[PDB]
């Protein structure tokens, strides 16, 4: 492999360089709301897929395995990105620089306000923990490799260990004690359980909007949805 030979600083810099851009929304009705989000997330998916190939160890996997991991974690990846963008905008969600929404606006779509609150709560957790960008890109890569790893693998677990070592190295650099290192590592990884939860609630809600045909969904998004069913 090529990921395992890397050092902690090389891993971070590689992930930082692989970071997708922050896209803009096309310049609120229930249909207009879902329309903006669908269009935005659709374009985000394309950048995510190319970001995934720049994740150390992901390219080593077979095509079918790469597909499986992305189908499983794509909404988790989108959400943790959203939460990260909205970190210094408390009470608000930064879907795009020209699209900053608060919980009130989430009420324009039925069942969405619950997901919004979960997203806002995650953002407050990142803010309270004072999450670093170097830590963020590690967590996002962990989600990609881990979320669908048990629906299949020693290679993926090897990379996951490397990202764990990478995380710890970042905390040691910040001057955190060993006790503070384990504890914050635990705090970070426990959030992934909630991000998974938000993804599943969001996945069902997307299927809901799909059924009501509130807006027509893209071929790509419908493919990702038909993987969780």
């Amino acid at each position: 492999s090529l990921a395992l030979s890397l050092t902690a600083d090389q891993m971070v810099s590689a992930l930082l360089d692989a970071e997708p851009p922050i896209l803009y929304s096309e310049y609120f009705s229930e249909a207009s709301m879902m329309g903006l989000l669908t269009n935005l997330a659709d374009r985000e998916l394309v950048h995510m897929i190319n970001w995934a190939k720049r994740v150390p160890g992901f390219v080593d996997l077979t095509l079918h395995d790469q597909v499986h991991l992305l189908e499983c974690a794509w909404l988790e990846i989108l959400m943790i990105g959203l939460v990260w963008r909205s970190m210094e905008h408390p009470g608000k969600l930064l879907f795009a620089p020209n699209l900053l929404l608060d919980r009130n606006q989430g009420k324009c779509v039925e069942g969405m306000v619950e997901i919004f609150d979960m997203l806002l709560a995650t953002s407050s957790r990142f803010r309270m923990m004072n999450l670093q960008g170097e830590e963020f890109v590690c967590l996002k890569s962990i989600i990609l490799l881990n979320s669908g790893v048990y629906t299949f693998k020693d290679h993926i677990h090897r990379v996951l260990d490397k990202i764990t070592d990478t995380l710890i190295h970042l905390m040691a650099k910040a001057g955190l004690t060993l006790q503070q290192q384990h504890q914050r590592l635990a705090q970070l990884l426990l959030i992934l359980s909630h991000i998974r939860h938000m993804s599943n609630k969001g996945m069902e809600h997307l299927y809901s909007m799909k059924c009501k045909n509130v807006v027509p969904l893209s071929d790509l998004l419908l493919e990702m949805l038909d993987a969780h069913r």
């Binding site: 394309v46 897929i49 190319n50 095509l63 597909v67 992305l70 189908e71 790509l220 493919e223």
Partner: peptide, 9 residues
């Protein structure tokens, strides 16, 4: 799949 193409592409 569109996913296959994008991953290849």
């Amino acid at each position: 799949k569109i996913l296959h193409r994008l991953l290849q592409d």
